[PDB]
Paper text:
We report the cryo-EM structure of ADP-bound [name]–DNA filaments at 3.1 Å resolution, revealing a unique [name] double-filament that wraps around ssDNA. Closer inspection showed, surprisingly, that the [name]–ADP structure forms a two-start helix, containing a [name]–ADP double-filament wrapping around ssDNA, unlike the conventional [name]–ATP single-filament. The refined helical rise and twist shows a helical pitch of 145 Å and 7.4 protomers per helical turn with a diameter of 108 Å. Although the individual filament of the [name]–ADP double-filament extends the length ~24% compared to the [name]–ATP filament (from a helical rise of 15.8 Å to 19.6 Å), it takes two filaments to form [name]–ADP double-filament. As a result, the overall filament length is reduced to ~62% (the helical rise changes from 15.8 Å to 9.8 Å). The protomers in ATP-bound and ADP-bound states undergo minimal overall conformational changes, with a root-mean-square deviation of Cα of 0.9 Å, indicating that major conformational changes occur only at inter-protomer interfaces, not within the protomer. Upon ATP hydrolysis, while the ADP nucleotide is still bound to the Walker A motif, the loss of γ-phosphate eliminates interactions between Q268 and D316* and further destabilizes the R130 interactions with Y315* and E322*, resulting in loop Y315*–E322* moving away from the adenosine moiety of the nucleotide. These local changes open up the inter-protomer interface with a rotation angle of 19° and extend the [name] filament. Taken together, the movement of Loop 1 and Loop 2 in the ADP-bound state dislodges Arg235, Val273, and Asp274 from inter-triplet spacing allowing the extended ssDNA or dsDNA inside the filament to transform back to the original length. While the central cavity of the [name]–ADP double-filament remains positively charged for DNA binding, the wider cavity (from 98 Å to 108 Å in diameter) and lack of Loop 1 and Loop 2 interaction gives ssDNA greater mobility inside the filament, resulting in weak and diffused ssDNA density that can be observed in the cryo-EM map at a lower contour level.
Residue numbers in the entry:
A (entry chain G), E (entry chain C): 21 to 270, 288 to 315, 323 to 336
B (entry chain F), C (entry chain E): 21 to 270, 290 to 315, 323 to 336
D (entry chain D): 21 to 270, 291 to 315, 323 to 336
F (entry chain B): 21 to 270, 287 to 315, 323 to 336
Write the structure that this text describes.
């Protein structure tokens, strides 16, 4: 799928200019092509002639022209469409979470948004014919709640081995608003080496709340969240990873425009745990992930 | 050894600046690495270039990148699980107090939340095989209920030396709502000189309730207590220390407590403990175990 | 012991900022340290720079950090531990009333609660070796029952001079609810220059119930009583005075207490007490019996 | 500065040019000398050579060169130090309001800053021996709080004729923001005929808070107030007249040589901080108690 | 007295530039002179040179220079100082309400503020030698309480003819917040045309209270009220009318800086209707205006 | 004719916007003239220039400037002054209910406040010389007490044909709080469709008492009732229609005190002999044929 920068080297001065793109945040040739000229100019050590040469060579490897809608329909076909463990949720989402798009989640507290993230991180490693995209998840946590013991229980019901499933999953444990951004930098390098399917960013707004209490800092955090969200859209594009964002309610803001699908959750007086497409489906939290 | 900040000095670090970072609150290279660039700039006398250099070197002394989930699993199979006595009959906590995470406590009054804090303060200094933390406790009293005689009474139950239990506890009464905050700043300095396995706040809200009695304040009480809790998480993970908070019953103040523990008055001496599982725990003359 | 506020002066603008804090109630450097930035900046005439400076200088004088329990055990040892005049009652409180604690008292009426206060008032003057702390009483009366005739009568029982005994004791005779509040500020002013031991506030709640008119002020009355005891604990802790509260029966006055001495009744003259154990003591013309 | 622009006229000056320069705001040669080439070239009808010759003759009249520190100390020993009556009690300002400087005040409301301005307006007319300035004041009211009856009463306390106290005081209410600058220009014009000793602005920032309501014109207000303060500094420096500015507490930080903060005290007794304290009481006949 | 803009024509172009100032709000030459440059610039159709010419002609027309304090003292004399119908109030106010200054009023309800507004309106028509200033009142009502029969009764008490006292009094009946400002703009015309003495704004804060209930509109209503008060002060200074403002209590805030005097009222219980200069005085509402 | 809004459609009015204003709540040019620019802007689909033009054309068709007190006195000596019945003896209101101004009512229970509401609804139909309103009422029941049989009885007491007294009363029960506001919106058009002389609310606080019960809202009920009363004042002083509001007592000055220019508080006096005093005295009875004893 994705094509590394190493292919871009053609009189481009290897190992003196390729890394200047590597620490710039670009890790694939298509990432450079999908990057503006000004994004390459502001990088130190890249001249106007050299930046033009890189973009000219980048456009040669990846196609950025006009394609007919029939070609796009089949490209939008064969989408991985990883499952979610619940039959009703599977029917409601027309096959679960779709790759290449950010799927947000909402809730008040103890609504299962962290819980259904765990059952996704294991089901993304299932083969295509039985749901997920046989990849590896990249769970990122901010409010520390990652419990690998839960992955053992949910992997047991699907017949997967308990050892192999943990090797595929990657953990981040972000601590600051900025540290989330450099995690995506290390994410892009990791996406090239191995096939990945999920980019769970559980509690993607928890950090922004804790260290931006200043009333005059709203304009600062709005742009910071926009850059983080914008970097999520692109990262989903080259690699086709179903980015999942968990957010705290206590509906519609700068995070909404970037998002493709939302799955507002809350409890219920009866039968518990319904979902929305802010359509309703039935799901519940059992010992082994989600159930009916 | 959780990497003290003295190891960050280089030619450009200008170790006179280490004391400038030390007075800010960051006494650990993990603290500055986990500190955002925003609060490095807010420190007076630190420039944009200086802050970048501090963060750049702090990054290469601690693992700040990704890790495989199987590595994190065995890093969870190292929790101390400090013993408590009679509450963990059939192991409601599955081992004991969760180290590296706050364990908040509730109750109405005369329930026994303060009493097991005394027992927790003597258990954490027991050897690991018996259920201890092999480290010395830390008490931050807030209402003035600290009784060092109780520590001696429970010490003889486990056979530990009476003289060796009092010198281990680091007691500090909090007369103020802000005095709690800078006690934690003084705490991080003390956590690197020796090994502490338990931090206890006798009442995280007693002075917040009485000092902030104004009708208008309300909101001001929130982010002040939020900063108190956000530092408790900061001390919890870069030292691997168990934090116990007791509160009086009858962002938010409910997102930081990894574990909760509500308490009830049963029939007579039969104390009741519940989690928001229930167990029989008592308050004997020599501790909590029945 | 307590350090007078005048020592705080080091470029601190004498008689203009020290005097400004004098009417604020902060008459010792301990009071300044034990007070937040809030009411130091709420005092008119103090800016943010001055408030920070006076707090910084106050911190350097009194210790505010962490101390080992061994230091606190000795500190909580050698307490004055004022006697109560009754040997059976003496051992039941393992030494009688203890300083630094708001020892409340209960009853119905004619229960001896005022009687033992007068006995406790004469005995605060005794030397360490046989009871009291060689200090002066600071009786505060609301429901007028202070009869100095009793003090001279009990003085000859213990063999003390009947003239110097009344010279040491103070007398307030509070009238209004706001009057009780401002006496405590004046109490701290006169506290510094003399060794004081006892702070009887006899009938500390019967004055408020006089002002209790209608149901539309219960919220305000509790808040006023909240900071009345808050000052008392803020006054006993950093001056080491044995505050005694005498309430009448049939987070208010329940949390701030340290000991209670319910005074049920008996067989007419067989007065007894609780620690809400029983102690046998008689009430006669010369104070109360042993 | 008893050195008028009239004496600048010469054979080559073409004294009609003096009148033409007067409208620019310059009425003393000390004003043109202290003004750069920029402030003279922008005046219509003045050529480069004319400005050069004007500045050369101004330099030949007033000296701008260096001076020994002893002479500077001696000339700063000749400060009038207009008295107040209760603020100066216990020698808070070591004499009172000093001439040649801006003495900005503060206050929340009813703190007494207007009343002490009234007291100063009559104390400046005292003979220098008693603590006055031997010059007529100048009141620039903005919020309409001027009351000559209070001036007459306070003059009665100090024992002066009421008619001579009032007719010396000059009054002018300012309605517009630019009206304040025009009033300062007229003040510079009229400062040369008679010896003045005090300039009172009742509330310099009052008109800026109401004329410049919103729509983000903050920068305009900022440099307009900067120009006002620079004009006042130039006036005080060239004429040696004490300048007093009051401000309303809910720029003016670099020009306030002495800064005062008035805040409510106990009853009629009030406290005054030098942003260091004193008891000033506002009586029925002034401030001195 | 006040001088109309029609005298401003010296190559000022009548019916094309004078009318622009008239529709902008200014109706007298001193209104233009007491107005800043930008208040003339922001009006469409007036250039910088035209504004300079208008300001210069106004400045030579009216005197905006320095005046000796003796002249201002004699100008503080001959103030109309209209009476109020109560000898106690007459002595307390040192002659009653004074022209050129807003006299605010406070009260809970049924305190007599509208009643004494009515007696002021009737008594402002008296000749100089016996109280009022032989002018015309302009009672502006927001919460409809204007009762002309009360004016008839009180005028009969004072001996004035009942026909003329109605002929001189003017009524507004404001409905909206902007309607008050438009009413003052229209009131400037009657200021120019005829001699006027009173500008009652009875319940000047009732409309602002009733149509600004939104918690997010406090800044807007404060700015509107500030503009309204500044307009009242400029009108009073221009024409020397005794503006009286009636306010509803249920202490002090931004409104007193523009105000000159306040007459806080209270019920009084025994003998009732006691007032302050927030010094005290006692008045009584008879069937005929105010009395003892 | 209180100037219906349909006359405001000029070349620049875009008569679809006229219907937009009509559904907004304003049905007369007087309503939009007495309307601040703020709420016209908040009407979704009206631009700043369009709102300016609407206000400008509203201003030049209705008088909004100053008027001499003689003109206002003449415009006040034309109140319709609807009669009441038995209270005709010793006129306390100097003729009866004041037109164009709310006449609030009180009483504990069983007093008869609803009965004289029926009598007012029938007397609004009497000719002017007889003391009526020459119009049709609007009873808005909020407690389910409206009974057309009493209307028939009182109509035959004054000798009016029943079919002519029934066809004019516009009954509308309220099940809700916002239903009252919607009813006022609908009544705004009914005012211009035909002449109306009285508006009656059976209990303006009955629904507010039962729909809002929690301690939480309180202020919500407060400004909801404030908006209700403001709408009532606007309709009354725009359309020249008397408004009568009855309330449940068990009391004095509150939000509805400022809005009601007049009161009439009723007591269960000596049996059949009821007593009414304004917040004077008048004794009236409630017979089978209405009020007149
Ligand atoms: N093994 C399990 N069996 C049944 N229910 C569970 C299990 N684990 C968790 N739950 C329930 O699922 C919920 C998960 O909440 P969570 O999603 O972590 O909260 P948040 O959305 O605030 O992060 C808990 O409230 C818990 O009651
Ligand atoms: N020696 C003892 N024997 C039995 N019970 C005790 C003994 N000492 C203390 N307790 C009990 O332990 C409890 C401790 O209460 P504590 O937790 O300190 O109250 P708080 O929660 O208000 O701090 C008391 O209610 C008391 O009944
Ligand atoms: N000299 C005495 N002889 C005998 N009995 C006494 C003497 N003095 C006091 N008493 C008894 O002690 C009681 C004192 O009442 P007291 O408890 O002081 O009232 P309060 O309830 O206000 O404290 C009286 O009931 C009295 O019977
Ligand atoms: N004759 C007097 N006797 C006592 N106090 C007075 C007298 N006249 C004025 N004052 C006091 O002087 C103060 C004047 O306030 P002022 O400085 O005019 O307010 P502002 O600073 O807003 O202009 C008033 O608060 C008043 O209390
Ligand atoms: N003819 C009269 N005789 C005596 N008193 C009257 C007469 N008319 C009105 N009043 C009294 O004067 C007061 C006027 O109140 P008013 O000031 O109009 O209320 P608000 O302050 O709400 O406008 C009423 O309380 C009334 O009692
Ligand atoms: N024919 C009649 N004779 C005597 N009394 C009657 C007659 N008809 C009605 N009433 C009285 O009129 C009263 C009307 O009460 P009403 O005002 O409807 O109560 P509410 O105030 O709850 O609406 C009743 O209490 C009833 O006693
Ligand atoms: Mg969750
Ligand atoms: Mg307890
Ligand atoms: Mg007693
Ligand atoms: Mg003042
Ligand atoms: Mg009134
Ligand atoms: Mg009834």
């Amino acid at each position: 799928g994705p094509q590394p920068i190493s292919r871009l080297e053609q009189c481009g001065i290897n190992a003196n200019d390729v890394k200047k793109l590597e620490e710039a945040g670009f890790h694939t040739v298509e990432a450079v092509a999908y990057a503006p000229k000004k994004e390459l100019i502001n990088i130190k050590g890249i001249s106007e002639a050299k930046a033009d040469k890189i973009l000219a060579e980048a456009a040669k490897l990846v196609p950025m022209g006009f394609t007919t809608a029939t070609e796009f329909h089949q490209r939008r076909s064969e989408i991985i469409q990883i499952t979610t463990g619940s039959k009703e949720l599977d029917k409601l989402l027309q096959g679960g979470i779709e790759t290449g798009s950010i799927t947000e989640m909402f809730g008040e507290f103890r609504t299962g948004k962290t819980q259904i993230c765990h059952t996704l991180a294991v089901t993304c490693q299932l083969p295509i014919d039985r749901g997920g995209g046989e990849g590896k998840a990249m769970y990122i946590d901010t409010e520390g709640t990652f419990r690998p013991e839960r992955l053992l229980a949910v992997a047991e019901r699907y017949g997967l081995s308990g050892s192999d499933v943990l090797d595929n999953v990657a953990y981040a444990r972000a601590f600051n608003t900025d540290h989330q951004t450099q995690l995506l930098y290390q994410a892009s390098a990791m996406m090239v080496e191995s096939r990945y399917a999920l980019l769970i960013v559980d509690s993607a707004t928890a950090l922004y709340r804790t260290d931006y209490s200043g009333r005059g800092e709203l304009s600062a955090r709005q742009m910071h969240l926009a850059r983080f969200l914008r970097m999520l859209l692109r990262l989903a594009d080259e690699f086709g990873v179903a980015v999942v964002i968990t957010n705290q309610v206590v509906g519609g803001n700068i995070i909404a425009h970037a998002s493709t699908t939302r799955l507002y959750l809350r409890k219920g007086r009866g039968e518990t745990r319904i979902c929305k497409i802010y359509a309703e489906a039935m799901f519940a939290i059992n010992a082994d992930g989600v159930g009916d």
